[PDB]
Amino acid sequence: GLLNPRESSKFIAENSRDVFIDSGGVRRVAELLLAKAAGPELRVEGWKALHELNPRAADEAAVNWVFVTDTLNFSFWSEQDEHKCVVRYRGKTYSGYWSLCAAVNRALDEGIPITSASYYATVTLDQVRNILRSDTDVSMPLVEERHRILNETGKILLEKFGGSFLNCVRESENSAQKLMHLVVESFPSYRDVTLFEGKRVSFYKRAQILVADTWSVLEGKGDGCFKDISSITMFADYRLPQVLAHLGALKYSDDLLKKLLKGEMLSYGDRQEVEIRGCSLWCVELIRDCLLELIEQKGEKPNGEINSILLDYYLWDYAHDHREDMKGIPFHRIRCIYY
């Protein structure tokens, strides 16, 4: 049945009708990343050093914070930029994914144990609305799905994993692939799989970002030392394709650009949606290959291994920091629990 995310993406990219990978753009992005390759933006330390809302500690508490944020890491876009969820934390203002992290830190600082499965297994919809409350008139999208997924995930964590995601990490035996599979097999909300040309393809956006963020919060050490961390792909969402299209690595058909410019909502597993996701994922694989070849050619000996995770982290931050520049090619619009 099931191709892994890397194999899925190659198959999708090779059979794509409406999304194209531009070799010139792949080269362009690789040359941009090469100039930043010595910076904190392309090292595991950047996950903490560049994002104040991320846990400082490499402890069980921090591992469970990553579990809860990645369990809810989906669908933060609003229809207009003037009209969106904002969460204030320690006198700073956050939107999109960061508004979720702000809301989690706000709850923990209030003494609400929102990162404990003993709490979120049975948290009510009322409680979740309060915890995720916006400081604007506009709510976070899909709060009912976030409530249901917290209950589902906390029940499984208590029953199968002693109420801590650190038990799942330890059972993975320093394998990123084993941790990815344990998560997808154990937690239904992580089953990010669909059809393409009658084959079962996988993306595992939330399961792979959970492994990457586990690696990051544990600083690639101890329980978070993953011998096969380079095997994790980019996290196929709506912001990464938008920044690859902006930088010229992805090209869209007229039918697809038409939908994007009008804000026509795509559905999970639509051919065009699967082509955007598969082409983005394969596109980062090619950028990473090109970057490593550029680094080999300059006779460089990087002080750390560059991988698809670190390219994703960089490009997602780039999307966040250059949102104004990217108006002309919108992100694709979808409401689903997978991303």
Side-chain angles (χ1 to χ4, degrees):
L2 186 56
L3 296 179
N4 68 40
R6 180 172 287 100
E7 298 169 323
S8 296
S9 77
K10 176 179 191 291
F11 175 57
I12 291 165
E14 277 171 0
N15 291 287
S16 183
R17 307 173 181 157
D18 286 280
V19 186
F20 318 111
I21 298 169
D22 185 290
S23 71
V26 162
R27 186 135 209 106
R28 196 253 261 239
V29 179
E31 293 183 21
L32 169 58
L33 291 161
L34 177 60
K36 313 306 217 74
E41 316 99 286
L42 286 176
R43 322 170 45 149
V44 66
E45 291 89 351
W47 187 95
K48 292 188 192 187
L50 291 171
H51 314 103
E52 64 223 328
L53 294 179
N54 284 166
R56 304 302 87 187
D59 62 9
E60 187 165 19
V63 164
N64 280 297
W65 184 102
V66 165
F67 189 54
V68 170
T69 59
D70 284 335
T71 294
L72 299 188
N73 190 347
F74 62 85
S75 204
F76 299 105
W77 63 273
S78 41
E79 304 251 339
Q80 301 170 324
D81 270 281
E82 313 89 278
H83 175 101
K84 75 191 185 263
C85 189
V86 177
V87 176
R88 168 203 297 118
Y89 179 71
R90 290 186 70 106
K92 291 177 189 172
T93 267
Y94 301 95
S95 67
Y97 166 76
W98 289 125
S99 78
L100 167 68
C101 297
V104 169
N105 290 345
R106 176 173 65 187
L108 287 173
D109 286 353
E110 281 168 11
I112 301 156
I114 190 54
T115 58
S116 304
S118 57
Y119 182 88
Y120 65 79
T122 56
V123 67
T124 68
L125 175 52
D126 203 49
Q127 284 175 315
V128 170
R129 292 195 199 283
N130 187 45
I131 285 160
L132 299 179
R133 67 187 175 283
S134 177
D135 290 307
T136 68
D137 287 350
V138 176
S139 296
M140 186 173 294
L142 304 187
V143 168
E144 304 94 336
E145 269 296 6
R146 296 181 206 282
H147 165 244
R148 192 190 54 78
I149 289 172
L150 279 175
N151 291 173
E152 169 196 286
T153 306
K155 289 202 210 146
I156 294 160
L157 231 233
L158 291 165
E159 288 182 17
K160 292 189 163 84
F161 293 115
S164 183
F165 182 63
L166 182 58
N167 291 323
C168 207
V169 175
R170 283 175 177 167
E171 284 178 23
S172 81
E173 284 196 74
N174 299 288
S175 172
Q177 289 295 311
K178 185 160 177 164
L179 186 51
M180 189 185 75
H181 291 304
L182 181 158
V183 169
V184 167
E185 292 168 32
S186 298
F187 298 108
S189 74
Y190 283 88
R191 297 174 181 167
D192 184 7
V193 177
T194 184
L195 294 177
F196 186 75
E197 296 201 344
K199 297 213 71 94
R200 272 218 298 162
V201 288
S202 61
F203 292 105
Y204 297 148
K205 179 264 170 157
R206 276 174 40 233
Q208 291 197 94
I209 207 162
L210 172 57
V211 173
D213 292 343
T214 295
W215 179 67
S216 293
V217 75
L218 293 180
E219 310 181 2
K221 298 339 217 318
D223 294 319
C225 185
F226 294 114
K227 64 199 79 183
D228 56 349
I229 196 60
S230 68
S231 74
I232 298 289
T233 75
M234 62 88 72
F235 333 112
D237 70 352
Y238 52 85
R239 291 299 182 175
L240 242 295
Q242 185 187 22
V243 67
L244 294 172
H246 173 66
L247 290 178
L250 245 39
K251 178 62 172 188
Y252 303 141
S253 74
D254 280 2
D255 187 64
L256 173 52
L257 229 179
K258 186 176 298 180
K259 296 191 173 168
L260 294 178
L261 285 175
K262 293 176 182 196
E264 192 179 339
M265 187 104 60
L266 300 193
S267 302
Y268 184 81
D270 284 349
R271 185 183 48 68
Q272 283 175 343
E273 181 255 358
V274 172
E275 290 186 0
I276 292 171
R277 296 185 80 201
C279 287
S280 304
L281 195 161
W282 190 241
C283 183
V284 172
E285 293 298 290
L286 293 172
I287 292 161
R288 183 215 45 228
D289 291 354
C290 181
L291 174 56
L292 290 172
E293 294 167 353
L294 283 180
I295 286 167
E296 220 191 37
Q297 274 172 203
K298 296 186 171 192
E300 236 159 65
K301 315 292 159 179
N303 300 340
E305 167 214 84
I306 306 291
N307 56 34
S308 296
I309 288 161
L310 291 172
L311 299 200
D312 192 304
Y313 285 175
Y314 179 75
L315 290 173
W316 190 90
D317 280 358
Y318 186 101
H320 192 271
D321 293 337
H322 296 53
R323 260 215 328 242
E324 284 285 282
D325 327 6
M326 301 193 313
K327 280 156 136 166
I329 302 292
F331 60 89
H332 76 275
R333 285 183 180 204
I334 179 170
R335 288 299 182 201
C336 79
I337 66 160
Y338 298 119
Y339 70 97

